[PDB]
Design a protein around this ligand. Structure first.
Ligand SMILES: CO[C@@H]1[C@@H](OC(N)=O)[C@@H](O)[C@H](Oc2ccc3c(O)c(NC(=O)c4ccc(O)c(CC=C(C)C)c4)c(=O)oc3c2C)OC1(C)C
Length: 212
């Protein structure tokens, strides 16, 4: 089972353009952010998330944080690992790739966040759920340790800090303009959700919240 999962992540790293799009022209790089944000938006659509933040760090890493339920943490009998680890490591975890419905939400969201994990040289997942803080670190999608309880919290939600792999992507430089344009659109499409974009490289920040 563990070998099968590692092979799946290796397949993403072998042919990244088939999962994320062009790895040189910035389209795949920005898709990495948009896939993580789309998971937070799904939590807003479900009725649990009102706040999403996207932070661009000085090392061109990204943090996406939401105040949703937090990815479930309970250990599966079958995989022997947290539900969260399965979500972060298995393409379309728990289900099929929907060849009928990918045209609406995109193929990338159809395979899911495990692609972002596979194509990140490092990813830190922090979950706030049931008053506990859980963390898991990955490298190229491979967990460093099982999801572990690291603290207590009054908050809930999911935080993903990822560093795109320079083995996958050339010209790893995020565009404020590309991110802001899409975030403004997501705000318009998702009334009441506050989407905060912060660029620590420049000190630029902008809250997008549509009240229509
Ligand atoms: C990347 O994870 C995404 C989530 O992303 C974010 N940012 O929250 C979100 O888009 C959505 O999150 C869901 C989707 C479904 C449930 C959901 O059905 C829940 N209900 C439960 O009672 C529950 C409790 C334990 C448990 O193991 C599961 C199934 C586990 C799943 C679906 C990962 C569900 C729940 O607590 O949280 C859920 C959450 C947080 O789907 C994921 C997990 C693929």
């Amino acid at each position: 089972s563990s070998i099968k999962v590692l092979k799946g992540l290796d397949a993403v790293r072998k042919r990244p353009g088939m999962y994320i799009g062009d790895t040189d022209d910035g389209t795949g790089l920005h898709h990495m952010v948009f896939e993580v944000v789309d998971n937070s938006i799904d939590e807003a659509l479900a009725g649990y998330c009102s706040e999403i933040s996207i932070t661009i760090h000085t090392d061109e890493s990204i943090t996406v944080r939401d105040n949703g339920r937090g990815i479930p943490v309970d250990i599966h009998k079958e995989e022997g690992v947290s539900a969260a680890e399965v979500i972060m490591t298995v393409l379309h975890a728990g289900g099929k790739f929907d060849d009928n419905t990918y045209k609406v939400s995109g193929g990338l969201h159809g395979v899911g966040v495990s692609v972002v994990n596979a194509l990140s040289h490092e990813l830190r997942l922090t979950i706030r759920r049931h008053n506990k803080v859980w963390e898991q670190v990955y490298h190229h999608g491979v967990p460093q340790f099982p999801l572990r309880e690291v603290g207590e919290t009054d908050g809930s939600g999911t935080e993903v800090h990822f560093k795109p792999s320079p083995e996958t992507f050339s010209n790893i430089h995020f565009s404020w303009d590309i991110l802001a344009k899409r975030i403004r659109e997501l705000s318009f499409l998702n009334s009441g959700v506050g989407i905060l974009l912060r660029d620590e490289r420049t000190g630029k920040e902008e809250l997008f919240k549509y009240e229509g």
